[PDB]
Amino acid sequence: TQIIKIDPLNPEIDKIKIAADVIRNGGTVAFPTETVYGLGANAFDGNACLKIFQAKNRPVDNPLIVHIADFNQLFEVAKDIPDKVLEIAQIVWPGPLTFVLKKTERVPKEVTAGLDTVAVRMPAHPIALQLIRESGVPIAAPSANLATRPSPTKAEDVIVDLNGRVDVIIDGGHTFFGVESTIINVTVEPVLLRPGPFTIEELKKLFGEIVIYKHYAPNTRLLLVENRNIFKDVVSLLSKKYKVALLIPKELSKEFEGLQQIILGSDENLYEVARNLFDSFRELDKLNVDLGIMIGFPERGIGFAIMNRARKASGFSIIKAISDVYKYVN
Numbered sequence: 001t002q003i004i005k006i007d008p009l010n011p012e013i014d015k016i017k018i019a020a021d022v023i024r025n026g027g028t029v030a031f032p033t034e035t036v037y038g039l040g041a042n043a044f045d046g047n048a049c050l051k052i053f054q055a056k057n058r059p060v061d062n063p064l065i066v067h068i069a070d071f072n073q074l075f076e077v078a079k080d081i082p083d084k085v086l087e088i089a090q091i092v093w094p095g096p097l098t099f100v101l102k103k104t105e106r107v108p109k110e111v112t113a114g115l116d117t118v119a120v121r122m123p124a125h126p127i128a129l130q131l132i133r134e135s136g137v138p139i140a141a142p143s144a145n146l147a148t149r150p151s152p153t154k155a156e157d158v159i160v161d162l163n164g165r166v167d168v169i170i171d172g173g174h175t176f177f178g179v180e181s182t183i184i185n186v187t188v189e190p191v192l193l194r195p196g197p198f199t200i201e202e203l204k205k206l207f208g209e210i211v212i213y214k215h216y217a218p219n220t221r222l223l224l225v226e227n228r229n230i231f232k233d234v235v236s237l238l239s240k241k242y243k244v245a246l247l248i249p250k251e252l253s254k255e256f257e258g259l260q261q262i263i264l265g266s267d268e269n270l271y272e273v274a275r276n277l278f279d280s281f282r283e284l285d286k287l288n289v290d291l292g293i294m295i296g297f298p299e300r301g302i303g304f305a306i307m308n309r310a311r312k313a314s315g316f317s318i319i320k321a322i323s324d325v326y327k328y329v330n
């Protein structure tokens, strides 16, 4: 694999071209976006897209998102787009919001898992936009992690996972938000399929009527304590019997000094917690602990997405009264 260091805010166009030539030749390129890194191929090339599933060991029926760099490309991959959706797409893109739309005949089965629909977004990241531009094709990509690991948000995550399994990794620094794009299905009348950095507060203003067995990393047991009023007591109860790690904001670090901590960022800046979330799950599994205990965060703004990912990551081990602890541990 060629690892290519490219400045994420002012990318060297000659370096972007090296990766774009790989895309056009049917090869795979991992690249940063504003959400998480993606592992991409030419969205029109179904054999090239199968290489993404081979690199990740991804089940073949989990479909990809097509990333576009302009509106001409939208109409190559999607059709029958309602006028209201088109007008909204023109004000939200580039940005961390993916639309599920009806596909065109040009989109391969490998991209859509055989579905009649295709998920599309225009990524708000200079490296991603310039890669797609220079490639001259939309780029299909899911998150760039190996199957059972958390979505990658910095180059080293992608390197550890995919080095030797993909043609190019673009080392483009840390992604901006750290959690995957919001996904809305606008082929039905519309449903929020995945919360993300494009918040439900903003969505509801644009789409008033919006409707709201996989194992998720980490492999270490992880409990999510939604009720902050019992957190100290859940930690007391469990740290007596287990070697624990606490996933907490920096404001609670002093209260638990002596226990292993993974600091997610500041309670006064949820974007920091979202930026650090998946890497805190990688750290948990590097440590040698019986279990992770994460505290909840407000479900406002990107909080909703943080908590969506945290619930999944915990296998829905949610603690709202301390007696809930019974259900998940001796």
Ligand SMILES: C[C@@H](O)[C@H](NC(=O)OP(=O)(O)OC[C@H]1O[C@@H](n2cnc3c(N)ncnc32)[C@H](O)[C@@H]1O)C(=O)O
Residues within 6 Å of the ligand: 033, 035, 036, 037, 038, 039, 062, 063, 064, 065, 098, 100, 112, 115, 117, 118, 119, 123, 141, 142, 143, 144, 151, 179, 180, 181, 183, 193
């Ligand atoms: C690279 C960056 O753009 C990142 N992509 C990513 O994280 O994709 P990822 O979540 O691994 O895979 C694409 C997901 O997008 C959803 N998806 C794709 N096509 C769909 C369709 N036609 N209907 C419903 N959901 C779809 C599925 O949940 C599928 O698992 C992101 O969305 O921010």
Ligand SMILES: [Mg+2]
Residues within 6 Å of the ligand: 142, 143, 151
């Ligand atoms: Mg993924």
